[PDB]
DNA sequence: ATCAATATCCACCTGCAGATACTACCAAAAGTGTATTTGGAAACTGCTCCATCAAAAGGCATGTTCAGCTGGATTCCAGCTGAACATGCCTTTTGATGGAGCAGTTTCCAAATACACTTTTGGTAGTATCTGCAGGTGGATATTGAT
DNA sequence: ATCAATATCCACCTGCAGATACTACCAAAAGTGTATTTGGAAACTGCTCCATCAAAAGGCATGTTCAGCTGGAATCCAGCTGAACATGCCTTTTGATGGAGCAGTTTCCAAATACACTTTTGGTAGTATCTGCAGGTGGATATTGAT
């Protein structure tokens, strides 16, 4: 047969961080999966346009960051940018 | 005299009831019949995954519910509480679905 | 009885959709108007879904066919894949 | 052997996000930090929704998040509602809302 | 004795006149100052290609003309000939610009 | 040197300019409060597009907003514009 | 002697350029040889369709040179082009004459 | 120093113009509109073909993806005529060499 | 004001569908390490075009007066649409049952990429000469509004 | 109806911006040919899940009656908003100039891809236990609408 990848185990991991005693139904998990795939596509797509517009062949964290700023409203963008920079700094120092 | 609620009272009760819930409001089989009939006009002898029909009913009900909200704002704009064909038509024209 | 399929979308069901839309009072002409609107929506979405089916050389419309069709129509739907 | 995710402090899979960027035909090349940054953004947005949805569950005296709770969380939140303005949540219904002019008396 | 057209006659003449032409209707230098002012509040020390300013003005006027068409339909829906703030607001709500 | 401070330029969108735009949109009669309403709606529209355009400018590390910055900004907000290098 | 891929396909629009734009656009890993032929032909045909209607509008206005106004009249007066380009703004195109009937004098 | 080449569809738009309206000219701003139009439609079709391939786990965009993209993107009659012109051009192209 | 008819809510209870925890198996995926390659930052700088200045002038904004006719308020009543209730029709359920066809696997070839080389061409630049039509004028026709 | 004030039309014109023409030039584009690689079509097949069937059962659609109250028609009038005018500011236009900064060329190395090899993990499939909450109860009390 085959395997179908999803974000289910990682969504669940994040759920236990924010609400340790809270569960999630499979239908709701499906919605979370759709959400993550959708935002992935939006950000990757915008980052793609950004690189192309500037005649670059590489998508870097700088393209991901400008994309996030273009796509997310105000405060969501601020915190996402912060979390993004934090994860790239920590990854670099390791 | 036997009991009667005033016109509108039960209508408001129903609004509260259905805005509270999430279940689909069109009957499944008749919806299923409609979908297969429309699809048959594009390609014959089709089959549907059960989840394909359900995805269509979720999308379609959400669309109509959203449309009825806009329609309701158009009726209220003209100082009515009754929605009419011209309210639906105005909403769809401003949404850019037509004309 | 020999009724059309679009006519199987009943007045009470349309009533319930309007109630969830916050509608208190409904003109008798709304029901036929709604059916016509409903049909155009289904035609638009199903046409695209079937175009994806045909491209994949399938005879079965899948949930993803419908999801891709809803997305390009600007009606993105969560919960059925993708 | 230590994963890029653990290396970056993330629950979301960096290696997968990288592989999805390459196969997605987004560009000829993908920098090393791009999947890390993107994975972090997706984890955070996921955390924000589950936070608000969990709260919605607790407010309805439930312990398990269902689609309805996701919808309440998103539509009641100004920014999530904007980000997801053209999205339909299956089995989410709508917010309680009755135009004032329709109320009796 | 002095000649007066009736109220609305000249307004209709003006509709025909501007619907026939394509020239921008907002004065150029004031629009450019508005663009510079807003931009400066986002980021200091920006310069603009002149075509960038023109592309903003073309887009802005097209948006507003299109918005006034929708607004007009909302007024007429309420059995009025006069557009009001609430017509604009209903148009923008149904468009999903403030939904 | 520096230029005079820019302020209150929204008022440069005059009542007759707004009347002309309304006429192109087919409007026969106009309430007195429409003019301030229109200024507010225009400012929001301009801010949104300019914000996205300047974001493109900065990402390119330029100090000059280009017509393409604007075209790209208009495109991503679903206001595709022809005629300026699309 | 070499024939262009355009001449070989019977096309005015450039097959070679269209093929190059498809590859540089990161649309897919590979591009079949038929793809830019079919695409160049469709673009040519839509161009033909718009220029046909735009030149008629120019003629209707006693002009021999197409300007953006004629492009806008052609598009908005044609139900299918209007639909395809329904979220497009044509610079210096203006709008179709159209006064709501209720606004006319009695 | 030479300012680099700016490619456009102008000479091709112009050729098609002379086919449909031999004595009709076109202004440079109208030509600017036409150039935007061709780029716009190019990207819309190419993007839809890209998605279509990806959905079906294909790494190759062939004329078949272009054709389905054209049917998804264009309304009724335009799609019909575009499809026939597309198909004709491909069959003519392969019947050669 | 009272008072009765229903709707609505809270507490508690219990069955089960769907969530969990478990072991185990395994291909794909993710990490690691090495060798090779190259995208694009840095440096330098030509050269476009952007900011700014001046200076004259008339198109157009501003502010006012006046009153036509619009919007908003009121009243009224015909009739449409909501509520209630009696039927009975058909959707829903569920459980089994062929078998369509989705999807996995294997094979192998037309068509793809990669590369070296040669020819062709569309874009820029430099001047130099047509040409469609904007905008001005004048005078005939059409439209509007008063009577 | 008539007639007068004013807008609108159309023909005619001229200036010129902008379109056309032509040669020179050239880097990149495009085509031809050859070698090498491989995506995905084709045929076959297993197993998922889709269509259909019967078969009650009752939930919910339909038809009908009755009237509450809503939509729409009609009438009034206060005052908002359009039309016309006087005034004169500031946008527009034209042209020049310095120099910011965009963009073109070349250099060069941090970081990319490309394999090969090894280790890990997420998806899976059975198998078994567990539990959050839907749905049903009764009984309190809130709401509604008649007096
Ligand atoms: Mn400021
Ligand atoms: Mn290089
Ligand atoms: Mn003044
Ligand atoms: Mn008066
Ligand atoms: Mn009135
Ligand atoms: Mn079979
Ligand atoms: Mn040439
Ligand atoms: Mn003229
Ligand atoms: Mn293979
Ligand atoms: Mn009565
Ligand atoms: Mn009323
Ligand atoms: Mn400098
Ligand atoms: Mn594991
Ligand atoms: Mn319960």
Residue numbers in the entry:
A (entry chain H): 31 to 124
B (entry chain A), E (entry chain E): 37 to 135
C (entry chain B): 21 to 102
D (entry chain G): 14 to 118
F (entry chain F): 17 to 102
G (entry chain C): 13 to 118
H (entry chain D): 29 to 125
What are the paper's exact sentences on this?
The nucleosome core particle (NCP) is formed by wrapping the histone octamer, comprising two copies of the four core histones H2A, H2B, H3 and H4, with the superhelices of a 145–147 bp DNA duplex. The core regions of the four core histones adopt histone folds, which mainly contribute to the formation of the histone octamer structure. In contrast, the N-terminal tails of the core histones, which are rich in positively-charged lysine and arginine residues, protrude through the DNA superhelices. Furthermore, the N-terminal tail of H4 is crucial for the compact folding into chromatin fibers.
In addition, although the crystal structures of unmodified NCPs are known, we prepared the unmodified NCP by a similar method, and crystallized it in order to compare the structures between the H4-tetra-acetylated and unmodified NCPs in detail, under controlled experimental conditions for sample preparation and crystallization. We overexpressed the unmodified H4 protein in E. coli, and used it for the subsequent crystal structure analysis. The crystal structures of the H4-tetra-acetylated and unmodified NCPs were refined at 2.4 Å  and 2.2 Å resolutions, respectively, by molecular replacement as described in the Materials and Methods. Overall, the two NCP structures were nearly identical, as demonstrated by superimposition. In the H4-tetra-acetylated NCP structure, the electron density corresponding to the residues from S1 to K20 of H4 (molecule B) is missing, which is quite consistent with the previous structural analysis. The main chains from V21 to I26 and the side chains from R23 to I26 are visible in one of the H4 molecules (molecule B) of the H4-tetra-acetylated NCP. In the unmodified NCP, these features are almost completely the same: residues S1–K20 are disordered, and residues V21–I26 are visible in the molecule-B H4. As for the other H4 molecule (molecule F), residues S1–A15 and S1–K16 are disordered and residues K16ac–I26 and R17–I26 are visible in the H4-tetra-acetylated and unmodified NCPs, respectively. In particular, the position of R23 in molecule F and its hydrogen bonds to E56 of H2A and E110 of H2B, in the acidic patch of the neighboring NCP, are conserved between the H4-tetra-acetylated and unmodified NCPs. The averaged B-factors from the three independently refined structures of the H4-tetra-acetylated and unmodified NCPs were plotted along the nucleotide sequence.
